[PDB]
């Protein structure tokens, strides 16, 4: 139920991912390419879902690896600005599972982001509090898959 | 190219666009459903397009088409803080233009936006010059249609 996700998220979970995104948000396209990357090396099983990005060894030089990593970053945008209104963010959320459930991504793969989350946080001097509560965020968007 | 048409957006557009948007960017659900349910109201041969949101004349209480409107609002938000640096506009313009070119919206019928857009604009009081502004970043996702 996306909807008893959604209640997990009290207001210390809120706090800290607001805290935590005011930083990462700041670089939208070195955090989301970074991201993505690291997702990539970590999980190579997960690269031929990404087949239409052509190589992604690029990285940054990859235009639309660049263009799918900012747009994923204004995803988590919404989600956050949507914190405060429960029917709100659920309803994104379905929206973003929609094009997830499309390429064929079930819940339990969809989580192998919260490896590369932890990871990129943990560079940001975000340690595991951070990371937790992101991944109860990425377990709302699950409850959709 | 699409770069030619993003390299040709002017200190006077942008600063337009960002002023306006400042405004209309305040309220992205509500004036993101304001702005499909003009389309819908003007341009009713383009309802059946949408079919993945259910009854579109529901409004605000259609969950989907909630979600969908809010989400649309992140495109346009992700448009603007991308405006002084044409290579990540270029490359964010290209990503969303493949989403509805897999739709068959061609770059005519992409332009119907543009009455809606004028529209809600004045709803706020922002008249032709700034309507004139967004028509031209329209202009640049039709370069990739
Ligand atoms: C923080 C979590 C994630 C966010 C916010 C996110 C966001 C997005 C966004 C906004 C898109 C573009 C949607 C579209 O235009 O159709 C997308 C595409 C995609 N995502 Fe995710 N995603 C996440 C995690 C994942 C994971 C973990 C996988 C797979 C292991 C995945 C697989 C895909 C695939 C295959 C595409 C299509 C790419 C393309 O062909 O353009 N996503 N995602
Ligand atoms: C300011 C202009 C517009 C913006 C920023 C915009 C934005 C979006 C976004 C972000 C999506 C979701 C992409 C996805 O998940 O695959 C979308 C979907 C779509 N758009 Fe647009 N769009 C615009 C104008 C139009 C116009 C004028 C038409 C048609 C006359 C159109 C037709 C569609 C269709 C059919 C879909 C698929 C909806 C669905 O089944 O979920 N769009 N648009």
């Given at each position: 139920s996306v909807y008893d996700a959604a209640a997990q998220l009290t207001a210390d979970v809120k706090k800290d991912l607001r805290d935590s995104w005011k930083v990462i948000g700041?670089?939208?396209?070195?955090?989301?390419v970074a991201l993505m990357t690291?997702?990539?090396?970590?999980?190579?099983?997960?690269?031929?879902?990404?087949?239409?990005?052509?190589?992604?060894?690029?990285?940054?030089?990859?235009?639309?690896?660049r263009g799918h990593s900012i747009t994923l970053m204004y995803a988590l945008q919404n989600f956050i600005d949507?914190?405060?209104?429960?029917?709100?963010?659920?309803?994104?959320?379905?929206?973003?599972?929609?094009?997830?459930?499309?390429?064929?991504?079930?819940?339990?793969e969809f989580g192998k982001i919260n490896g590369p989350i932890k990871k990129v946080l943990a560079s940001k001097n975000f340690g595991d509090k951070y990371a937790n509560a992101w991944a109860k965020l990425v377990a709302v968007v699950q409850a959709a898959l």
């Open positions: 700041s670089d939208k396209k070195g955090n989301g690291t997702l990539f090396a970590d999980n190579q099983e997960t690269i031929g879902y990404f087949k239409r990005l052509g190589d992604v060894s690029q990285g940054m030089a990859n235009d639309k690896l949507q914190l405060d209104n429960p029917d709100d963010l659920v309803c994104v959320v379905e929206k973003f599972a929609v094009n997830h459930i499309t390429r064929k991504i079930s819940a339990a």
